[PDB]
Design an enzyme around this catalytic site. Sequence first.
Site, short mmCIF file in Angstrom:
data_model
loop_
_atom_site.label_atom_id
_atom_site.label_comp_id
_atom_site.label_asym_id
_atom_site.label_seq_id
_atom_site.Cartn_x
_atom_site.Cartn_y
_atom_site.Cartn_z
NE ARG A 50 -3.93 2.05 2.36
CZ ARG A 50 -4.04 2.89 3.38
NH1 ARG A 50 -3.20 2.80 4.41
NH2 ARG A 50 -4.98 3.84 3.38
CG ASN A 127 -5.33 6.89 5.28
OD1 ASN A 127 -5.30 5.66 5.29
ND2 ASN A 127 -5.03 7.60 6.37
CD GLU A 128 -6.90 6.19 9.23
OE1 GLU A 128 -6.65 7.20 9.91
OE2 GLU A 128 -6.43 5.08 9.56
CG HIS A 196 -7.63 1.91 8.25
ND1 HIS A 196 -7.08 3.16 8.02
CD2 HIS A 196 -7.74 1.32 7.04
CE1 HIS A 196 -6.80 3.29 6.73
NE2 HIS A 196 -7.20 2.19 6.10
CE1 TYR A 198 -2.95 1.19 13.55
CE2 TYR A 198 -4.77 2.03 12.23
CZ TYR A 198 -3.44 1.66 12.35
OH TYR A 198 -2.63 1.78 11.24
CD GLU A 225 -3.61 2.77 8.00
OE1 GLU A 225 -3.47 3.00 9.25
OE2 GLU A 225 -3.46 3.64 7.11
CD1 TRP A 250 1.26 2.50 10.61
CD2 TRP A 250 0.47 2.90 8.55
NE1 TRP A 250 1.68 3.77 10.24
CE2 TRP A 250 1.21 4.03 8.98
CE3 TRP A 250 -0.10 2.93 7.28
CZ2 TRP A 250 1.40 5.15 8.17
CZ3 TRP A 250 0.05 4.06 6.50
CH2 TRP A 250 0.81 5.17 6.93
#
Length: 298
Positions: A50, A127-128, A196, A198, A225, A250
Site C-alpha cells: 500500500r 485514507n481515513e 482500519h 486499531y 491497516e 501498518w
Amino acid sequence: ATGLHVKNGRLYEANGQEFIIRGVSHPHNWYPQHTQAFADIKSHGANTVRVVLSNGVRWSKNGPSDVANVISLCKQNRLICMLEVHDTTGYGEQSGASTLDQAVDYWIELKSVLQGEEDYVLINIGNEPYGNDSATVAAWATDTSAAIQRLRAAGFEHTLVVDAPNWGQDWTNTMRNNADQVYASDPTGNTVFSIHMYGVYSQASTITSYLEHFVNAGLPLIIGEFGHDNPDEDTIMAEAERLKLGYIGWSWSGNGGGVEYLDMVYNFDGDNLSPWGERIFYGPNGIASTAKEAVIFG
C-alpha cells in the site's frame, strides 16, 4: 479493460484467480529516498504494498512521473500496488485535510499513468477520509458514492478501495450499515471497502462481528491497516485467514508522531525486524506463510 475485479463479494484477477491481499504500507511520500523498500517487502513474502501518496493538499504532491516510477517498482518486484491519497485523513476534524473530491481531482490528473494498469494497481481513493465530527461523518456515504461516480465517469476501470469514517475505524458503524448503498452506486461493482483496526478493535468479539457482517452480506472487505497489541492482532490475523480476507499491516518503517512501535523494520533496514515485523511476517497466520503472489506475474 478491467483487470482486478470483484465477483460475489471477493477479489479476483482477470484470469479468474482469487486474490487475497497480504501486504504492508510503505510511506513513500515522506521517504522518497527509500525505494529499496519495494524489493525488501517482497523478500519477506508480501504480495501487495500500500503506497502512501500525497495530492499536494497537506504534503508535497506526487506527480505523474513519480507515480509511474512507483508502479514500475511494484511490477518489477511482483507486488500488486495499492496507491492511496493520504491527505484526506481525519477531514472534518483534522485541520487542513483534503476532501475526497480533491483526492478525485488528483487521480484524474494521473489518468494517463494509471490507465492500462488495472491488473496491477488498486486505487484507495483517500485514507481515513473522515475524523469523528458528526456532521461530516454523516456525509461518508454520499461523498464516497460521489467520488466513485466521478472516477467511473472519467474512464477508470480499476478496482477502487474506499476507507471508513471515524479515522478509518468506523466505531459509529456508518460504513457497516451503509456499504450496500455505496456498493450499488458503482455501475461496475468493482469497489472494495477497507476497515482500519486499531484501539476500537482490542476485543475479539468486536473484530469477529465486524468481519462477519461483510462476509455474510457479500460486501467485499479488506483490513487496510491494523496495528498490534491496542488491537488484538492475533485475532485479526486468524480471522482474516479463516474468512479469507485481505489484510495490510501498518507500516514498514519511519513512523513518527508517537507511533514508532508500528515500525516493522528499524530505519528501513530490511534485515532488521522489530517484534511487530516478526509477528506480521513470520508469526501464525502471517504474511510469509499465507501470502501467494498474484498470478498475473507468472
